[PDB]
Amino acid sequence: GCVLLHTSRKYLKLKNFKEEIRAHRDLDGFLAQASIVLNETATSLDNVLRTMLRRFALDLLMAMLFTVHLLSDTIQGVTAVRYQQSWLCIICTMKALQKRHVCISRLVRPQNWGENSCEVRFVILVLAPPKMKSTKTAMEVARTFATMFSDIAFRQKLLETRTEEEFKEALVHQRQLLTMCKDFVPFGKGIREDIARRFPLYPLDFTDGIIGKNKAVGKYITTTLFLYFACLLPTIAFGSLNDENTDGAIDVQKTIAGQSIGGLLYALFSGQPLVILLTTAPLALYIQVIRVICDDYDLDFNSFYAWTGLWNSFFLALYAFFNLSLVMSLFKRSTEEIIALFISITFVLDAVKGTVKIFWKYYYGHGQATAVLSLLIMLGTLWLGYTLYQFKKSPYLHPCVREILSDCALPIAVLAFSLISSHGFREIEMSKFRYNPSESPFAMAQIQSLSLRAVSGAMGLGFLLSMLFFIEQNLVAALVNAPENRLVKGTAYHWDLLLLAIINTGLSLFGLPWIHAAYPHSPLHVRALALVEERYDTIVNVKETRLTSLGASVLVGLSLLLLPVPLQWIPKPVLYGLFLYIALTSLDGNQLVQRVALLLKEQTAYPPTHYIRRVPQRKIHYFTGLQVLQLLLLCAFGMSSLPYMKMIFPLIMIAMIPIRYILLPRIIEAKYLDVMDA
Amino acid sequence: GCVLLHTSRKYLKLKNFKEEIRAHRDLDGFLAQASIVLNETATSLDNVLRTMLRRFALDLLMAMLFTVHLLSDTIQGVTAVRYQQSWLCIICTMKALQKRHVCISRLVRPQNWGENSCEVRFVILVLAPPKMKSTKTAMEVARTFATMFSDIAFRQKLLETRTEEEFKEALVHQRQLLTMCKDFVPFGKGIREDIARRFPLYPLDFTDGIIGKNKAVGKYITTTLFLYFACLLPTIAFGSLNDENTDGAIDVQKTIAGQSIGGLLYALFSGQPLVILLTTAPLALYIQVIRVICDDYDLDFNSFYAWTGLWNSFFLALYAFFNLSLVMSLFKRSTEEIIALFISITFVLDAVKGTVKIFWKYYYGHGQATAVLSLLIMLGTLWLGYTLYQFKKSPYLHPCVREILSDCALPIAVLAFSLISSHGFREIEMSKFRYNPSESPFAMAQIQSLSLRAVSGAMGLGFLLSMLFFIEQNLVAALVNAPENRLVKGTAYHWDLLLLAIINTGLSLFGLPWIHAAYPHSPLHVRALALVEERYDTIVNVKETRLTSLGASVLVGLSLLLLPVPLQWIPKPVLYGLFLYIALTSLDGNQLVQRVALLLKEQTAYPPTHYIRRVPQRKIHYFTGLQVLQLLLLCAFGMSSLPYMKMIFPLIMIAMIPIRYILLPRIIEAKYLDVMDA
C-alpha cells in the first residue's frame, strides 16, 4: 500500500548558555552519566543506532526512532542556506523511559547517509519520556547539544580527541566558551514635555475607534458600562462610610459629585486618560481622622479638611514641578506586584468585613434570613460575574456576541442579583446604604476662618497625603503604562500629578472626598480596551481613548438625579460581590500570584516562562517566599486595627525600595533579581 | 550565523473518500474555483511557486512557504519504503487569507529538486487561514489531494490530458473510483453461558488490584466512600418518601435493609459486579399506587405488595430463561443516551421540586432563613463537589494526592456542608427526613391471605414491573458493558436478570422496597474505577472488582446501627446537591449532550469526532433535534403529574425502537444513523 509522509521543517534558536541554566544542567547531567561511543566502525545509521541503544542498556527501540530521511525527528545545523553534513542529532520520545538519556557517537570515517548527511561524523541520540517539563523535553535537551555541535571549531577539537576523558573535557571547555541627580535639574521640564507629547495626539483620543476601520464602538459601550458599575457602587460605599465617619459632613451626594467632577476633568485634560480616579479606603481614613481631630479641638471640619487638601495639592504641585516622579521608576515588577496584590486583598477583606458586620448585626441581633441571603447574594454575584468573565475563552457562541456578553460580566451580575435580592426576595430585608437629602449646599469651607497652630497641623497631614498621593498615582499609572500594555501615545507622569493637585484642591475647598488613581479600576480599564492574541496571552494593542472614562464620569454624575434608586435597589452584598470580582480579576497577569501557584504545582506543569528559563527553580521559590514576607509586612501596617500605623503605610511602600535593592541582593544573586524585573 | 533546523516526519493515513465527506467537499470546492496550471515551463521550484501564487491573485507570499528541503511543510507519497518523486504537495498557513486556496501545477518536463523529488511533475499548493475547523485545515485539504495523487494510474491519466476541462474531468473520475428467532431457541443457554464465563474469573474479582503490581487500594477506598454517599442518601430520601406514601408500612429502616441485603447478595453472586442496585422514584410510584389500591379495597398492603413482587420475579425469571435479554441489543447509542439523559434530568428535577417544597413550606409559611439557607446549601454542595470533581484535571498537586482528593469529591462535599448546615447554622432550622423507631418487625407478608381476584391484579402490576425491571436492568448493564469501557471479563446479562428476580422476591416477601440497576450510579462506578489516558479522553482499563460494591453494601447495612445520625446531621439540601452532582457528572461522555452543545458553538471549535467526519453537519443537527424531540416525549410521559401515564413509561421506552429503526430512516439516511450508533 501507499502512505502519505508529512515533513515539517522549523528553525530553532541556538541555546543560550549565558542565560538559560538548563543548557548547563543538561550538559552536567550528561557528563555525570556519559554515554560516549569512540571510534564507531559502523558504516550504516542502523548499526550506529543499535550500538548507542545497547550502550544505553532492541529491535523495538529502533522502531520508535523511525517512522536518514525516515527518522521521525532530527536537528541539523544550517549556515546562512547550507546544511551541516558533519553532524546529526536524533530525537525520540519513549514512554517506557524514566529519565533522559543522551549518547554521542563519533564515526571513524565520514558516512554518506543522505542529501544533507553525506559527511556524518557525530551522531547525537536524545531519549526522553513524553511527560516532562517544557524546558527539559527531548527537543530542549537536543537543542543544548545541537548548539555546541553547530560550531565548526568545536567539532574539530572532538575529532582530535583520543580517549573518552579528553572527549568530555572538550565538552566542558566548549561550555565555558559559550558561557563567557542631573535628571531633576530642569524644573518644569517634565510638565512641558508631557503636554508636548500628548497635545498633538489629543484629537486622536476621541476618534481612535470611531472613524475609519476597526470601529470599536461595541468595546466603548461595554467598557463604559463596566466603569459605571465599578466606580459608582464603591463610591456609594465610601460615601456612606464618610457619612457615618464625619456625622453627615461628607455624604453620598458629595462623594458622587466629586467622582463625577474629578473624573470628567481628568478624562478631558490629562495625558494617558486610561487612569481612573476614585476615592479609596485609606483616603476615608484620613477624612475620619480629620473629624476626630476636629472633634478633639474646636476646629471646623470643612475649614481643616480644605486646608490639608490645599497643602496636599501644594506639595503635589512641587513634585510635578521638580520632576520627582522619576524616582518612582525604581518600583519594578518585584515591588509593584506586592503592592498590587495587597490592594486586591483589601478589597477581598472589605467584602469579608462587611459580611461579618451583617452576621453580627442581623444573624445575632446586635433577622437571620437577611444574614443568610447576604451570603448567598455576595457569593452568587461573584460566581455569575466570574463565569461570564471566563465565557470569553469558550467556543459556545459567535465571537462578536460572546465578546459583548463577557465584557458585560460585571454589569449583568450586579443587575441580575439586584433583581433577585430586591424582587425575588422582597419579603427579606436587605442591608442598604443610608440615604438622606442634601444638607451641606457646597460651601467654600471658609479657609480663612482657620487660624495658625491649625494650618500647621494641616501642613503635617498634607505632607502625609502628598506621599500617599505621589506613590499611588505613579504606581497605578506605571501599571497602565506597563510595557506589556502596548501603548504608542505616551506616559505623561508629571502633568497628571500636577493636574491631580488642581483637581483635588477644588474638591477640598468644596468638601468633596479626595480622589487619585485607583488600582483595580485602571489596569482593568486598559485590559477591557485591549485586544488579546491568545497565542501565552499577549496584548496586540489597546484602544486608547477618552470616551470610556469621560462617558463613565458623565453617567456617574447623572446618577445624582436618580440617586435614591441605586441605594434602595442595590444592596450591600451585591457591592461585596463586586469587590470580590474586581479583586480576583485584577490578579490576572500578576507574576507574584502566578509564582505562588507555582509552588502548589507539579514539576511537569511548569510553563516555559522567562524567569523559569533563566532563574534557578530554588531561587525562584526563595524570591516568592521573600515577596510573601514583604506582603505580610504591608498587611501588618495596612490592614491593622490601629489607624495611626495605617496612615504611615506610604512610608512602608518607600521602605520596600531599600529592601529590594539592598537586602534582597544579599540573599539572591542580583542578576536573578533583574530577570524578575525584566 | 548558524541556526538549528528541526525536521519532523509523520505518516498520514490516506483520506477515505468512501466515509469522509470532507474529501468530496474539498474536491468540489476546488473544482468550483479551479486554479490549474497546464504546461508549466518553469525549471525551478521558486518559479512554479511564483506562477501559482500570481494565479491565486508576491515575494512576501513565498517567504511564508519556506523556512525543496527548505519548504516548511510538505506531503509526499511513500510506497512500502520508497518515496514517490513524481508529485509533491506544498502546504502553507497564511493569516491574511479568508478562504482555502488549492492550486495544481503540471510541469512539461520532470525536474530534479532533491533526493526524493527528482522526477517532479505535479506540484500541489494548499493555502488556508490558521483558524479553521479541524476537518478542513490546510493539512486536511492537502490529504484529500495527496490521496488522489498517490495513485500511479491516476497521475498517468493527468499527464495524458491536453486541456483544463479534461484535467478536471480526470479529477472527477478519480473521485468516483475512490468513492466506489434462532437465538432464543435454546432455553436456559444464556444463564449457563454467563455462569461459565464468570465462575472461573470469580477469584480474580477479589484479587484484581490487591495482590501483585498496580495495587489500586486507594481507588477501592475512595470508590467505596463515593458509593456509600451516593447510595445511602438517596435511599433515605426514598425510604422517607415510601414512609409518607405507605403510612409507615415501608420506612427508612426497611429501605436501607433492602439496599444492604440486595446489594450484598448482588455483589457476591452476580456477573459484571459493577452494576449498583438501588431503588428509584418510579419504583416508589408503584409502591404508592399499591397503597392506594390497598386503600380503595379491603386488601392488606404487605400481602398485595408481596404478590406483585412475586409475579414480577416470576416474569423476570422467564425472561432470563427464554434469553429475552438479546432483544435489548437493539438499544444502541441513539436510544440509550436519550434514556440516559432523561434519568439525569429527573434527578435535577428532584432537587428543584424538593427546593420548591422548602420554599412553599417555610418561606411562605404553609421560617425564611430555612428556605434561603436551603438554597445556599444545595448550590454550595454542587459547587464544592463539582470543583473537586474537576480538580483531577489540574497541575496544582501531586498526582497521587490530587487523584485521592478528586475521587472524594462527593464525600467531602456532603460532609463539609453537613457541618456547615448543622454546626455553622445551628440557630437555623433545616428540613430533615423523618425518623421513627421500627414498627413492622420484618414479617412474611402472609401471601396466602390474599385471595383470587387480587392475585390477578398483582399479576397485572407484576407484568408492568417486569417490563420496567427488564428494560432498566439491561440498559444500565449495557452502559456498564459499553465498548468504550474496556472490560475483559464478560457481560452476564441473563444471569443477572435471574438473580435480580431471586433478590427481589425475597425483598417483596419481607416488605422491602424493590431495587434494580441504577443509572447514575453504575456508569459512575465504572468511571471511578477507570484509568483515563487523557490523550480525546479514553479509558485504558477498568479495575473490575467486587470489593467496592460489596464494601459499600456492608457500610450501608452498618448505617442502621447509627441510623439517627445521618438523618439529623445531613439535611435535605445536601441530598439535593448530591442529586445535582450525580446528574451533572453522569452527562460526561454523553454524545447527545455533546451534540446539543455543538449547536451553540462556533464552527472553528468543532472537534474531529467520528460522527462529524462521516456525517454531514446538517444531518448531525437534524439528528440532534429529533433526539431532543424524543426526549420531550419521555418527559411528557415520565415527569407528568398523572401517575397512570408515568407507570406506562416503559412502553414509551419500547416505542422508541420502532421510531429509531422505522421513522428515523425516512428522515435521515440509514448509513448516517449507523455512524451515530457506531
Coordinates of N, CA, C and O in Angstrom, one line a residue, chain A residues 493-559:
Chain A
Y493 N 3.6 61.4 33.1 CA 3.6 61.3 34.6 C 3.5 62.6 35.3 O 2.8 62.7 36.3
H494 N 4.3 63.6 34.9 CA 4.4 64.8 35.6 C 3.2 65.7 35.4 O 2.7 66.4 36.4
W495 N 2.6 65.7 34.2 CA 1.4 66.5 34.0 C 0.2 66.0 34.8 O -0.6 66.8 35.3
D496 N 0.1 64.7 34.9 CA -1.0 64.1 35.6 C -0.9 64.4 37.1 O -1.9 64.7 37.7
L497 N 0.3 64.4 37.7 CA 0.5 64.7 39.1 C 0.1 66.2 39.3 O -0.6 66.5 40.3
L498 N 0.5 67.1 38.4 CA 0.0 68.5 38.6 C -1.5 68.7 38.5 O -2.1 69.4 39.2
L499 N -2.0 68.0 37.5 CA -3.5 68.1 37.3 C -4.2 67.5 38.4 O -5.3 68.0 38.8
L500 N -3.7 66.4 39.0 CA -4.4 65.8 40.2 C -4.4 66.7 41.3 O -5.4 66.8 42.1
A501 N -3.3 67.5 41.5 CA -3.3 68.6 42.5 C -4.4 69.6 42.2 O -5.1 70.1 43.1
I502 N -4.5 70.0 40.9 CA -5.5 71.0 40.5 C -6.9 70.5 40.7 O -7.8 71.2 41.1
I503 N -7.1 69.2 40.5 CA -8.4 68.6 40.7 C -8.7 68.5 42.2 O -9.8 68.9 42.7
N504 N -7.8 68.1 43.0 CA -8.0 67.8 44.4 C -8.1 69.1 45.3 O -8.7 69.1 46.3
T505 N -7.5 70.2 44.8 CA -7.7 71.5 45.5 C -9.1 72.0 45.4 O -9.6 72.6 46.4
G506 N -9.7 71.8 44.3 CA -11.1 72.2 44.1 C -12.0 71.3 45.0 O -13.0 71.8 45.6
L507 N -11.8 70.0 45.0 CA -12.6 69.1 45.8 C -12.5 69.4 47.3 O -13.5 69.4 48.0
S508 N -11.3 69.7 47.8 CA -11.1 70.0 49.2 C -11.8 71.3 49.6 O -12.4 71.4 50.7
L509 N -11.8 72.3 48.7 CA -12.4 73.6 49.0 C -13.9 73.4 49.2 O -14.5 74.1 50.0
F510 N -14.5 72.5 48.4 CA -16.0 72.3 48.5 C -16.4 71.1 49.3 O -17.5 70.7 49.2
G511 N -15.5 70.6 50.1 CA -15.8 69.5 51.0 C -16.0 68.2 50.3 O -16.7 67.3 50.8
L512 N -15.5 68.0 49.1 CA -15.7 66.7 48.4 C -14.5 65.7 48.7 O -13.4 66.2 48.9
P513 N -14.8 64.4 48.7 CA -13.7 63.5 49.0 C -12.6 63.5 48.0 O -12.8 63.8 46.8
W514 N -11.4 63.3 48.4 CA -10.2 63.3 47.5 C -10.3 62.0 46.7 O -10.8 61.0 47.1
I515 N -9.8 62.2 45.5 CA -9.7 61.0 44.5 C -8.3 61.1 43.8 O -7.8 62.1 43.5
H516 N -7.7 59.9 43.7 CA -6.5 59.7 43.0 C -6.6 58.4 42.2 O -7.7 57.8 42.1
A517 N -5.5 58.0 41.6 CA -5.5 56.8 40.7 C -6.0 55.6 41.5 O -5.5 55.3 42.6
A518 N -6.9 54.8 40.9 CA -7.5 53.6 41.6 C -6.8 52.4 41.0 O -6.7 52.3 39.7
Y519 N -6.3 51.5 41.8 CA -5.5 50.4 41.3 C -6.4 49.4 40.6 O -6.2 49.1 39.4
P520 N -7.5 48.8 41.2 CA -8.2 47.7 40.5 C -8.9 48.2 39.2 O -9.0 47.4 38.3
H521 N -9.2 49.5 39.1 CA -10.0 50.0 38.0 C -9.2 50.3 36.8 O -9.7 50.0 35.6
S522 N -8.0 50.9 36.9 CA -7.3 51.4 35.7 C -6.7 50.3 34.9 O -6.8 50.2 33.7
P523 N -5.9 49.3 35.5 CA -5.5 48.1 34.7 C -6.7 47.4 34.1 O -6.5 46.9 33.0
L524 N -7.8 47.2 34.8 CA -8.9 46.6 34.2 C -9.5 47.5 33.1 O -10.1 46.9 32.1
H525 N -9.4 48.8 33.2 CA -9.8 49.7 32.1 C -9.0 49.4 30.9 O -9.5 49.4 29.8
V526 N -7.7 49.3 31.1 CA -6.8 49.0 30.0 C -7.0 47.6 29.4 O -7.1 47.4 28.2
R527 N -7.2 46.7 30.4 CA -7.5 45.3 29.9 C -8.8 45.2 29.2 O -8.9 44.4 28.2
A528 N -9.8 45.9 29.5 CA -11.1 45.9 28.8 C -10.9 46.4 27.4 O -11.5 45.8 26.5
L529 N -10.1 47.4 27.2 CA -9.9 48.0 25.9 C -8.8 47.3 25.1 O -8.6 47.6 23.9
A530 N -8.2 46.3 25.6 CA -7.1 45.6 25.0 C -7.6 44.5 24.1 O -8.7 43.9 24.3
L531 N -6.8 44.1 23.1 CA -7.0 43.0 22.2 C -6.0 41.9 22.5 O -4.8 42.2 22.5
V532 N -6.5 40.7 22.8 CA -5.6 39.6 23.3 C -5.5 38.6 22.1 O -6.5 38.1 21.6
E533 N -4.2 38.4 21.7 CA -4.0 37.4 20.6 C -4.3 36.0 21.1 O -4.8 35.2 20.4
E534 N -4.0 35.7 22.4 CA -4.2 34.4 23.0 C -3.3 33.4 22.2 O -3.8 32.2 22.0
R535 N -2.1 33.7 21.8 CA -1.2 32.8 21.1 C -0.8 31.7 22.0 O 0.2 31.0 21.7
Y536 N 2.1 33.2 26.5 CA 0.8 32.5 26.1 C -0.2 33.5 25.7 O -0.7 33.5 24.5
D537 N -0.6 34.5 26.6 CA -1.5 35.5 26.3 C -0.8 36.9 26.2 O -0.1 37.3 27.1
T538 N -1.0 37.5 25.0 CA -0.3 38.8 24.7 C -1.4 39.8 24.3 O -2.4 39.4 23.6
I539 N -1.1 41.1 24.6 CA -2.0 42.2 24.1 C -1.4 42.8 22.8 O -0.3 43.3 22.8
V540 N -2.2 42.6 21.8 CA -1.8 43.2 20.5 C -1.8 44.7 20.5 O -0.8 45.3 20.1
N541 N -2.8 45.3 21.0 CA -2.9 46.7 21.1 C -4.1 47.1 22.0 O -4.9 46.3 22.3
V542 N -4.1 48.3 22.5 CA -5.1 48.9 23.4 C -5.7 50.1 22.7 O -5.0 50.9 22.2
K543 N -7.1 50.1 22.8 CA -7.8 51.2 22.2 C -7.8 52.4 23.2 O -8.7 52.6 24.0
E544 N -6.7 53.2 23.0 CA -6.5 54.3 24.0 C -7.5 55.5 23.6 O -7.4 56.0 22.5
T545 N -8.4 55.8 24.4 CA -9.4 56.8 24.1 C -9.9 57.4 25.4 O -9.8 56.8 26.5
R546 N -10.5 58.6 25.3 CA -11.1 59.3 26.5 C -12.6 59.1 26.6 O -13.1 59.5 27.6
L547 N -13.2 58.4 25.6 CA -14.6 58.3 25.6 C -15.1 57.4 26.7 O -16.1 57.7 27.4
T548 N -14.4 56.3 27.0 CA -14.8 55.4 28.1 C -14.8 56.1 29.4 O -15.7 56.1 30.2
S549 N -13.7 56.8 29.7 CA -13.5 57.5 31.0 C -14.4 58.7 31.1 O -15.1 58.9 32.2
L550 N -14.5 59.5 30.1 CA -15.4 60.6 30.1 C -16.9 60.2 30.1 O -17.7 60.8 30.9
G551 N -17.3 59.2 29.4 CA -18.6 58.7 29.4 C -19.1 58.2 30.7 O -20.2 58.4 31.2
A552 N -18.2 57.4 31.4 CA -18.5 56.9 32.7 C -18.7 58.0 33.7 O -19.5 57.9 34.6
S553 N -17.8 59.0 33.7 CA -17.9 60.1 34.6 C -19.2 60.9 34.5 O -19.9 61.3 35.5
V554 N -19.7 61.1 33.2 CA -21.0 61.7 33.0 C -22.1 60.9 33.5 O -23.0 61.4 34.2
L555 N -22.0 59.6 33.3 CA -23.1 58.7 33.8 C -23.1 58.7 35.3 O -24.2 58.6 36.0
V556 N -21.9 58.7 36.0 CA -21.9 58.8 37.5 C -22.5 60.1 37.9 O -23.3 60.1 38.9
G557 N -22.3 61.2 37.2 CA -22.9 62.5 37.6 C -24.4 62.4 37.4 O -25.2 63.0 38.2
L558 N -24.9 61.8 36.3 CA -26.3 61.7 36.1 C -27.0 60.8 37.1 O -28.2 60.9 37.2
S559 N -26.2 60.0 37.8 CA -26.8 59.1 38.8 C -27.4 60.0 40.0 O -28.2 59.4 40.8

